Amino acid sequence: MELYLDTASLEEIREIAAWGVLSGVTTNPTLVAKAFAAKGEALTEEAFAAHLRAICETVGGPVSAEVTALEAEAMVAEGRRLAAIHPNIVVKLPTTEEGLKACKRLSAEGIKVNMTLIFSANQALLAARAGASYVSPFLGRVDDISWDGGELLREIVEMIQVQDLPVKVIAASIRHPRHVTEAALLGADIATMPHAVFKQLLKHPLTDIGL
Amino acid sequence: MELYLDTASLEEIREIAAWGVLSGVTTNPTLVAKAFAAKGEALTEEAFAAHLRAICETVGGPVSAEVTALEAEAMVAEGRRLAAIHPNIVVKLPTTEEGLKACKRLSAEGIKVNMTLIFSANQALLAARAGASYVSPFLGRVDDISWDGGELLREIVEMIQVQDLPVKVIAASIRHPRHVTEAALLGADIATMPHAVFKQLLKHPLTDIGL
Amino acid sequence: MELYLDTASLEEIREIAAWGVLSGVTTNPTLVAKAFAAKGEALTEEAFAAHLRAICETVGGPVSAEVTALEAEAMVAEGRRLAAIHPNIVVKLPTTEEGLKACKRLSAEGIKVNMTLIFSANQALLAARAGASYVSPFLGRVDDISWDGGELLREIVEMIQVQDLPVKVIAASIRHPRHVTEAALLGADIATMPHAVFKQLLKHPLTDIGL
């Protein structure tokens, strides 16, 4: 399973990159905001593009950028602008009716689409059907409402496997180390997680005592 | 799993086709009549074929048209007529002794047949043996008589899988979203459902909240 | 498993009562409103209590009546009123922070409480812990968002048994005959459904031909 960092922090990214285990990165408006806020710069379109481009160069792998439009037409326009930032950019769209429409168009144009905000295997199926390259179910948010996020992932992976669909599954909304193991054991293609969880992955008491 | 619409309404077909997830359509006289009633047009034999042709062009995928005859020879004649309307048309026959004889003759002539009204694995096996391209078990109508429709589908899918049969399975009589997920998890090739269910598939409170 | 009717229609209740299988009734403002709609009469506070009293007399078993207040104090006052209408009255409260507070107080006063709008096992556990006499998970509504409603029921029933909790489970939001069978097989104490589902439970082709 490939591991992705769910952040916009170039420092966090560069650190995990050095480990040699970073396959990609996923961002969203709030994560990009925290980045600039925590830095000595204002968030302008010019700066936004340069930051995404810099992340793409650092990671050397796919980087997801979220559209904020609510209507399909505007979503497509925005997706194209994001994809025009760097060849490694994957466009992230919410799995809704409009998102579905946008996914069909963008993917028919050769632009890779990551369908996010998925909370059911049926949503994942429609997205795959609409041309999604990636589907991102949210494990943590499911646990938040007292349901088993892991079972959501399982149904999606199992459905994609028996149906032989090409879409790749991204275990998202990772809250702890076992979310990663579970996704790996289930057959997820990718797991994206915050820097803190990534930093926890490598820790174990028996390891230290062995050093 | 490919998604089909069980309707004759071009408006509905257009809405879902725009999502980019529509792989086909299945109809019946009832459905074509209704569509024609919702409109101010008389349902004449000609306007009929014209309608089926409009659906084929709109979905750009397989479209099932039901024969009304009960005798093998009449079914075959009607079947040839239907197939001539457009090359995307699939002939739907009832799974009866006559349906079997007709299915045998039609499939031999290179005409794809959808065997419907299937309520047991044995009927699915006979239909498959007769050359059917598709078999359509009815999940909902089974639940209707207090039996588990999902188990019906399970036996049909497993048998076909165990027996290495070419025939494709269409889960029909879809009543709710879990019927779709189940069919997909089991390995059904297609699920055909009414517009209302298709519109329910995308709904989840957490997606709305995430927007 | 005891079977209940979810309605306010004395006519529907009389019919099922005649069968000799009606153990109780669940109502909500909308159902009561519709009841007075079909017939000719204004829905006043005095006729409302008169109607619930009548229902209690026709079924001769527990009748659930919904609180309207959103804050605890008002919920307790309204619950006492409903419980004073007739000894067969069970007070239904939403499973929220306020409903939990109101549940503790009404149950301490010997009033039977039905905690409704339950969509997770954790909500049912809190309700039971709060003194609920009944807990009502919604199967169909969960199915509506592409999750397995029966699996919510399962988790709730299994926790209750393993924990030896006194609370009884009411399978609500029944949509089809199999929801009933699954609730019975799982161990739900009660299943409450609309008159249309109740009327479908006896139907089967073999019985008809058998007669």
Added chain:
Amino acid sequence: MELYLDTASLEEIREIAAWGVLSGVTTNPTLVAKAFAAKGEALTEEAFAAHLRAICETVGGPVSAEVTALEAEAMVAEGRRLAAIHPNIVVKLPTTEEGLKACKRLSAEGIKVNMTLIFSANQALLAARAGASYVSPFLGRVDDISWDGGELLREIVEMIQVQDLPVKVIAASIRHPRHVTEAALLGADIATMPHAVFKQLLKHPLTDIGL
């Protein structure tokens, strides 16, 4: 598991009765008609009663007698007449809406009711709810339409066990030796079968050579 004979033939009843393993008998208008025909005796109202009495005295256990009316009030009238024939008589009713009405009324007066023509766990549940003493699902006829009769029995037995219901289960429509075993293994209370099957039960190769 108690074993019953589904017949009206005193000769057959007598033979099995002597093995000391016959607990009861179930009959219907047909089987009684064949009995009289074979005995070249006219089926009068006086002979009918005497024959049932004769069967009751011979087996010395419960004897099921079928009502013919379709309407509830008539089913009850005939039900009382039947029960008055002999105290061993158990009244059999079709599991329908009228059957349910008649079941509640006759069971309330102390008369034991056998609800038959059951093809779903839901029908069994309503019957148990209406006061049935016995519930009779038909295994063979379910097999006749390519569904597993043993699964119907399984679901019914499990539901009754889990719901801790008083009603007893009579595995009916027995066609071969394995139906009996399965019923015994699943937990059925009674298995009523035809003489021909009862005779097959104790036959086995190794037994004869052992002799």
Added chain:
Amino acid sequence: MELYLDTASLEEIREIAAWGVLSGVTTNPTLVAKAFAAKGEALTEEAFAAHLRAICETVGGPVSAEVTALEAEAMVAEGRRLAAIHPNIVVKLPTTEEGLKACKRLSAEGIKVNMTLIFSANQALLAARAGASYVSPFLGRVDDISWDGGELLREIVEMIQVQDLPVKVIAASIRHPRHVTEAALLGADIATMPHAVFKQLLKHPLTDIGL
């Protein structure tokens, strides 16, 4: 699980009884004959009786004696005489129509019956229903025809547990040590075997090496 000896040899019985693990003895004519043949003794009623009584006195547990008649009335007379020789005697009958008839009478008179030559669960069930105190399925002989003797045992045991039948199960036709273990784990009440097998039970390399 109580252990029995399949023999009529007083020296064999005496050696094992010394171990303190002998609960009973099962005999048959061929066995009794070889014991009398070992000496120059004639096999006559008084000697036969004296010998069985000696067995009883020695084992201090139930002792099974086989009837030879093939007609019930004769089986009954023989059973009564066998029972009269000593209170620990259990009458063994073949599981057949006549055997069932005899079982009913003998057991109704307070005589313990051991139905043998059992090869199916249905035979065991008929025997149990006829009044048998014990049923003796033959594991070894079933394995002789390439079937699983243990499965015969399992089904009988399960049926007995599930059905709450009084009868006890004697794992008979025990050929080897694992048969004993197999029968112990499957829940058989008793296991009767030849002296040769009893002497094989406690053998094990590690025990000897541990001495």
Added chain:
Amino acid sequence: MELYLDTASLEEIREIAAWGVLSGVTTNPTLVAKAFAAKGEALTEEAFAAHLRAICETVGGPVSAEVTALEAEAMVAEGRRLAAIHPNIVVKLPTTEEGLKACKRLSAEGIKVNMTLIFSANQALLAARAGASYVSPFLGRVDDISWDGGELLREIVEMIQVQDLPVKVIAASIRHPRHVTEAALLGADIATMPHAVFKQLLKHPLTDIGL
């Protein structure tokens, strides 16, 4: 399963106590200091004792207080002082050799002991054998080490159930709602969690949309 709060904040304790679902509280030095920091009060022995009594009075159930010594003698002395603070006080000891010694001594004097910092079933067994009234496995800290904490709880509960030990199990180090559900399903007696998790337990989108 009984719900406990893992905090020393009275404001948090009072809010959940009012829901009527709080069965107890567990504390530790760090949690106490935070509570005092938040109220801006000096943490003296007297204020500490008054604070603990305040908690005991608000919850009206068991309250765990931690000993800070690691020698058995000092642990016992400290445990006696904590127990003397209020009759609802349960003494928490670390599961170590010294902890086992103190546990023996304290439990022998009627003081209830909660053995904590348990990460293996063997530690839980010793603690139980030493006289612990409660054992507290840490679920979250195991997950942090990339091992399955829910599995640790499973092994502990199963062992406890299988061995029929009276010790009660407190699922601790709760990080999310599913830890609570899982612990309840496994059969744990108690779950102790932070206020944020307790508050998340009631949350579910379908409940809000239902209001």
Added chain:
Amino acid sequence: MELYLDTASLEEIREIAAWGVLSGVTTNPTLVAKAFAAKGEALTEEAFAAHLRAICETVGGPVSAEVTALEAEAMVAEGRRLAAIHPNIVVKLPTTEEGLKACKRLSAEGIKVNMTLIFSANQALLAARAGASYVSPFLGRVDDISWDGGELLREIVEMIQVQDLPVKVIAASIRHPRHVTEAALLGADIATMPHAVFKQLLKHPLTDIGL
């Protein structure tokens, strides 16, 4: 599961008895030889019994004394002597024919017997049938020859639970911490181990880190 020490060292016994987890002790000739050897004390029937009695007073529970005779008659005499040393003494005998004979007589006299050197379910069964109060399979010696010792324990416990035998199971030959856990989980009544394994049970990195 009760924990025992396999040693004759009164110092080791005292250390563990001080944790309040020591339920008994198991000894053998070679073990007591070491104790005296280490103390430079001379072996004498007077000192021997004085030492075993010292053990008894210390532990305060059952103490196993190995019998060295190989002949039943001698085993019994030697057994009566050991039993006379202290009322807590449990006589250990080899599971052989002679052992079984000695076990029968000794147990009949009211003396608790521990049948050791058990390596198969059949041996365990014989021992229990002979009046043994305990059976001691050896897990480690089985693992020593590439067979799963745990599986031997599994079969012994299953059989005992299945056959409702009174005998208690003592998992012997414990080599590591998981032996204890596995034995506890399988349902062994007691686990006896050397002091070194006892001192390992509590070890765990997270416990240390937590302090």
Added chain:
Amino acid sequence: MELYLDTASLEEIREIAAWGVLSGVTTNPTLVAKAFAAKGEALTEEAFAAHLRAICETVGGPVSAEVTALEAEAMVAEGRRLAAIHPNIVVKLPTTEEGLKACKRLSAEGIKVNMTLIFSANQALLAARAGASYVSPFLGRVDDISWDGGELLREIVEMIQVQDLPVKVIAASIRHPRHVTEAALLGADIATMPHAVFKQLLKHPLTDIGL
């Protein structure tokens, strides 16, 4: 499953090699010192090199050589040196942040890395994603802290299988024969064990008497 020797003893290597079952050897600084000591020489740079080279040539398989540095750069410099000694040498790195960086560099340079001190599947996945050729979970050390070492082997193997990762699994910390069996059954590619363990693999009582 390939079998390795965890030693630096040419004698041991030669013995097991003669068996023809030795596929490789794992070494560490310690094992090297003990070999030189027993030999009589003090390890120098060239002495160390000629020894590892001798091992390679003797085994004719891959040999693991442990790095000593703690910082990435140093681990790389030292790793390049070990690799230069011979082409059979596999560099062994500790699975830590630094080890990962080292592994990434070294493995890119064609050198094979063995990541050791792995105690979680998440650690194994990171090692694998860093380019590791082998991952070595320590079964024994896990069993030491009372957890199941096999479970950790099982998760690493399942994950590597499901994720189709190149990496091979080396089961380390092998203590007894059954660790070998378990590793093999669990699908480990290699098991490295000390000479003393190989020496017990072939032992069995029945084999002894077989000769």
Added chain:
Amino acid sequence: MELYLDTASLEEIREIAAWGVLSGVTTNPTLVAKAFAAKGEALTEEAFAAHLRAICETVGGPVSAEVTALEAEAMVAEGRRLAAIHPNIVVKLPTTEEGLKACKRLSAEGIKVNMTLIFSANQALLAARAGASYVSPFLGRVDDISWDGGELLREIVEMIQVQDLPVKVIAASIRHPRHVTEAALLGADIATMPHAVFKQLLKHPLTDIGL
């Protein structure tokens, strides 16, 4: 599963081979000793070889000949001569340290080796690692000591499958028919048995009555 005969009797080999189901033969000193005894001839190096050569020509498949040496050098020399007798000959060595050393050299020369006297999966593994083409576990001897032989075969087969080892499994020590069925269902490649068992394989009472 290929069937083999365990004998030297050319007569027996000739009969079974007539059935068309013999794929090979297994011999040993004893067996050939009785073949030459019943026949008129003495056992000489010339007679031996010639005889085995005849068996080869008769069976048309592999023939296993056991060496009698006890040292690697003696086994190799003796192994070379046996393979020289005929190309079908398979050299059977005992699974010991010497046998392994032998196996390595022989197999390395191109001689097919059959390792025997295997009573543990570890032995089968070492053997397979040494070059064995066949491994032979003895089910019967294992059952003899009250352990389950099938379980050993199962583990050996599971290990070989998972590890994808070339070696073939010959199920030896077959005492009866079910051993053959059990070895087949488990997945053994070959089953070697005595003439007597073969003659019992197709026995069935239903086949007889079917004739």
